[PDB]
Amino acid sequence: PQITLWKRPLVTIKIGGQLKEALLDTGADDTVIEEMSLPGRWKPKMIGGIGGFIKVRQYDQIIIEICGHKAIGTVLVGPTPVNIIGRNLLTQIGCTLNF
Amino acid sequence: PQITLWKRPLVTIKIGGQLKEALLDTGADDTVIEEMSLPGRWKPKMIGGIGGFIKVRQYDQIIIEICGHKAIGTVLVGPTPVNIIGRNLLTQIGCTLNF
Numbered sequence A, B: 001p002q003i004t005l006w007k008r009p010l011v012t013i014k015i016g017g018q019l020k021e022a023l024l025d026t027g028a029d030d031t032v033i034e035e036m037s038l039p040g041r042w043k044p045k046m047i048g049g050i051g052g053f054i055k056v057r058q059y060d061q062i063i064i065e066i067c068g069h070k071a072i073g074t075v076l077v078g079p080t081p082v083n084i085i086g087r088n089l090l091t092q093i094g095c096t097l098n099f
């Protein structure tokens, strides 16, 4: 698909058996999701951007489905204002910028 | 061009006759640049990101080249961690997400 940028590029994702809305974000190194349960071990991480840093839990080898494309990667969970799909998963679904 | 996302999508921009590096950021509504001098009057704006909100100065109708493509539009100036080209200008240069 081709997604224009007149509005926020929001998509439905499936993660941890839950459906969520998330933003396809080429400015994010990592993927961060609002508070939810995920399986496995985690470790704490700080992530920073406009407004400063927040603390999140880092879960590895999590499967997500993003617009019908399956991928696996690290997912961070914490008090993000918006669910964000970052480059670590955008690459896996073959997402590129084109102009 | 087509820009893949295995690395940060950093590009060269030209603003105020000077070259700077900036990030193509589909997660950003607006374009925000580190402190610099821009002509004309500015208005106040608050923008919020992953760590909270910051105050910036809004300049309208600013000439800016992004990867050699000419745009003219709103540029915010303030304490951003990285120069960010947001959707207001990514649309001007005809940028889309594709997968």
Ligand SMILES: CSC[C@H](NC(=O)COc1cccc2cnccc12)C(=O)N[C@@H](Cc1ccccc1)[C@H](O)C(=O)N1CSC(C)(C)[C@H]1C(=O)N[C@H]1c2ccccc2C[C@H]1O
Binding pocket: A023, A025, A026, A027, A028, A029, A030, A031, A032, A047, A048, A049, A050, A081, A082, A084, A086, B023, B025, B026, B027, B028, B029, B030, B031, B032, B047, B048, B049, B050, B051, B052, B081, B082, B084, B086
């Ligand atoms: C014009 S700058 C402000 C911009 N915000 C927006 O466009 C819209 O914000 C909002 C929309 C809706 C509700 C909100 C509620 N509270 C606050 C903001 C809200 C923004 O910062 N967008 C960021 C994404 C975001 C969207 C909505 C809420 C919060 C964040 C941006 O696309 C990004 O990733 N940025 C801007 S600064 C940056 C470093 C280039 C990068 C970043 O934070 N990256 C970090 C990140 C993000 C997520 C996961 C990991 C990491 C590491 C690091 O890579």
